[PDB]
Design a protein around this ligand. Structure first.
Ligand SMILES: Cc1cc2nc3c(=O)[nH]c(=O)nc-3n(C[C@H](O)[C@H](O)[C@H](O)COP(=O)(O)O)c2cc1C
Ligand SMILES: Cc1cc2nc3c(=O)[nH]c(=O)nc-3n(C[C@H](O)[C@H](O)[C@H](O)COP(=O)(O)O)c2cc1C
Ligand SMILES: N[C@@H](Cc1ccc(O)c(I)c1)C(=O)O
Ligand SMILES: N[C@@H](Cc1ccc(O)c(I)c1)C(=O)O
Lengths: 220, 220
């Protein structure tokens, strides 16, 4: 493969500060929203939002991500049955006292109404390896990190397009959800995002983010 | 902690589509750039771009990320020695034939001039656990996925601010770099981004991203 010159849009120092400031204020309004309206969302916003995720870097240019988008209420309800079943066992037994205590501030439990109400579910699967045209396995270097980076870009895109979601990681729901949606064995579910508008009764925990001097360290 | 109403941001469906289209076109221009000018960048843009990263979701709201920013020519050079030294061993022995063959199309080698030329290096450390005020360890659920999500948001923010970078994972360099920059034992380096304007003669591999129908699957 050939190498080509890199073409860049140069911004004046003042334009950069402004764009960077606005983008921060924009994304800082993003909250994980666990209460989602059933009102339909324009499918072109979803398409672009996933196109964008696919612009993520990936280890050795492997693109090890599958974004499975579920619209069908029937399928969605089967997903809800599975996750609620496993989460109940997760809260009652598998996560442990410490974890369950650490979640009190979020008031979450194994009841997940948004899996039904949200018009759209995005299930993100990592490809723990891939296949070339000849059918031999190609290695997916840092696939979990690559897909997660892509999930970050997906989250920014949803915020930018004015939709809401919550990044969820349903423990022990992977194999079952994989089988239900007909995904191949080399795919493993990494996380699930319900996407839509906030329902009228939406709340969030009153969480505070660290001040800059607590996430950033400058060295001299 | 109390729970509060979530404030709905109201967009017309069409403005939403327009925003989603523009954001895709913006991020699709992002490329990993391994040739970086030494032209200084405004530290406020860095501050904002890192603020943005800190708005990322995190498992049970743990915010397990430390963004170390290195400006100092001297420290940067010590980092360069470390990474070039280890990458040489990586290409010659530790990565293996297949991996080295897989990197040919990128024309990368163990020489990393950008580590000196770039005005700023951002080293992203995951906190594999934390400490409460009482000195007991708190658990950082999915810290690596969380930090990676933050890095994704970071990459978008840099792209939006007209800065460039390449997402790097310097094999076996974590411990030496941790000690060099005086980071506590609960921090582990996840990746390194050289940040700045692209140098004049910068190139990129002519890579193609998958079409939408190859990363997205819709279900009924
Ligand atoms: C890796 C990861 C996994 C998460 N899993 C869940 C989950 O299973 N359920 C849930 O309600 N939220 C989950 N979240 C969302 C966090 O609880 C949320 O980000 C955190 O409470 C901070 O709130 P905020 O997103 O509004 O800033 C997850 C976040 C991350 C980064
Ligand atoms: C987890 C991860 C690790 C990476 N590590 C390196 C690295 O060590 N060196 C490097 O030159 N590029 C690294 N990259 C960048 C990829 O090589 C690059 O994203 C890929 O070739 C596609 O190019 P693009 O980002 O311009 O689309 C990494 C990317 C990811 C997601
Ligand atoms: N990290 C080494 C080698 C390398 C290069 C590109 C890439 O996508 C991956 I995964 C590894 C380096 O920096 O050269
Ligand atoms: N996944 C379960 C429990 C849960 C909830 C929030 C959170 O940040 C984490 I890490 C785990 C659920 O969805 O309830």
């Amino acid at each position: 493969v050939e190498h080509i010159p890199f073409s860049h849009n140069h911004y004046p120092e003042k334009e950069m500060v402004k764009r960077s400031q606005e983008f921060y204020e924009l994304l800082n309004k993003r909250r994980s929203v666990r209460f989602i309206s059933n009102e339909q969302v324009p499918m072109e916003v979803i398409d672009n939002v996933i196109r964008t995720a696919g612009t993520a870097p990936s280890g050795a240019h492997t693109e090890p991500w599958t974004f499975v988008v579920v619209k069908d209420p029937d399928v969605k309800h089967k997903i809800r049955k599975i996750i609620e079943e496993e989460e109940e066992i997760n809260y009652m037994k598998r996560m442990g006292h410490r974890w369950v205590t650490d979640l009190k501030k979020l008031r979450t439990n194994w009841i997940k109404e948004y899996l039904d109400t949200a018009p759209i579910l995005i299930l993100i699967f990592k490809q723990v390896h891939g296949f070339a045209a000849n059918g031999k396995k190609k290695v997916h270097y840092y696939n979990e990190i690559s897909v997660s980076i892509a999930c970050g870009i997906l989250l920014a895109a949803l915020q930018n397009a004015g939709l809401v979601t919550v990044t969820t990681t349903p423990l022990n729901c992977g194999p079952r959800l994989r089988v239900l949606l007909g995904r191949p064995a080399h795919e493993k579910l990494l996380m699930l995002l319900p996407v839509g508008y906030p329902s009228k009764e939406a709340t969030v925990p009153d969480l505070k983010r660290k001040p800059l001097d607590q996430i950033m360290v400058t060295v001299h």
